[PDB]
Amino acid sequence: FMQTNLVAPVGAADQCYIVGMVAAKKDFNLRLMRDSPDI
Amino acid sequence: TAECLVENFLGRSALVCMRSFEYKNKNFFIWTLNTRELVQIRRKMELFTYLRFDTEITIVPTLRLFLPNLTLQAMYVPTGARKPSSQDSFEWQSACNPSVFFKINDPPARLTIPFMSINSAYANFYDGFAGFEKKATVLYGINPANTMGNLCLRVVNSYQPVQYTLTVRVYMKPKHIKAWAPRAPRTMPYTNILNNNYAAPTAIVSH
Amino acid sequence: LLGNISRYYTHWSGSLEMTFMFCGSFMTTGKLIICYTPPGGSSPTDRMQ
Amino acid sequence: AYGEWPTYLRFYTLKSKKWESNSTGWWWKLPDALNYRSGFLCHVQCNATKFHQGTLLIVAIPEHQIGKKGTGTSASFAEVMKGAEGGVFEQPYLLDDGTSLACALVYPHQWINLRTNNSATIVLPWMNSAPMDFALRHNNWTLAVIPVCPLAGGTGNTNTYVPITISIAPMCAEY
């Protein structure tokens, strides 16, 4: 959430963007196979 | 160096109460010890947020007739105890309670009060209301632990035909002072003896 | 990769991590609160929750 | 500074105040802002981009009885209680206490000057003359923040709202 509003200089637009990324950690485990529904 | 030690800065005996009453062809005092009745000592004291001290108090009478060496009683009444109704009252007799009788022509009476509060120091400012919960009538900042009792005084021999005014002057030497949390100086006139309000107003120094 | 690989399997265990990244101009700043809702929680409706 | 580690005997982040070139200043009262014998610490920073100009004095005052102009009348509930929403300084130059802003540096003070630093932090150890206050009805410290020099820089759409973000932790609080 925008806890402050944004602040930017006169030379840079409000077209400012976040990228989000994810992974599992070292501790991860997957139990037992069942074929994927996406294809 | 001299009055640079805070006990010497503060320890000048302040005339904290100055009043009169007559006896002629009611008329007793009950003033609580708070140093807000006189403006110089108000400011000089307000430079510190908390102080712990004994108080010496000295009582000096004076007379304008219209000398009779009367007996004066000073009594100290603690925080929130009963206080008398008139020159005559059972309270002036109180068994469990400090008092001094002195004659007007003796050199003036002195007492020490030890440091007297349920809090560890006098909090010279306090911005709260109560120790448990607040009602509408509980005024902002008048802390009960700062009540410090009252000095109560009467003429004991007041039957006299002769007609006059007793003046009394009360001098407090706060003594053996320990102090904490200094403050920015109070740079503005004082409207009242309770809070700090005002009405120089918008520019503290000249051009 | 998390959601593709794991789709081949019955149930999963262990921790994740997000990484966010901000594509801004160097002179630009702001504070975003991020907050996380553990299992069984309600959605935080606004910044006070 | 007062030289205590925060001590007895998780932060909270207030919504950002929209500063402007004209703004007089803001305050919060502790514990009131948390809604307890404690070492509060307060950590305040500007969301200010490098073109911006102006400066804040950050001060924590003990037992700060807010006064008022033009009456002997004492403050009401709603004037002194403000929670995390906080209150304005009606007269910053008098610090509302009839005392000079210029002398407020006797209280533990820090500067946000936008050249040198956009961030400042203070430790507020317990000052109460009772050992553990427990009622909702007193505030031992007031955090105050005042624009000593007016906010400036930027143009047009930037609209001078350059926010202040305030953060508080009651570090080492016991009950």
UniProtKB/Swiss-Prot annotation, chain A:
It is found in: Virion; Host cytoplasm. Forms an icosahedral capsid of pseudo T=3 symmetry with capsid proteins VP2 and VP3. The capsid is 300 Angstroms in diameter, composed of 60 copies of each capsid protein and enclosing the viral positive strand RNA genome. Interacts with capsid protein VP0 and capsid protein VP1 to form heterotrimeric protomers. Five protomers subsequently associate to form pentamers which serve as building blocks for the capsid. Interacts with capsid protein VP4 in the mature capsid. Interacts with protein 2C; this interaction may be important for virion morphogenesis. This is Capsid protein VP3. It comes from Human enterovirus 70 (strain J670/71). The chain holds residues 514 to 552 of 2194 of the full protein.
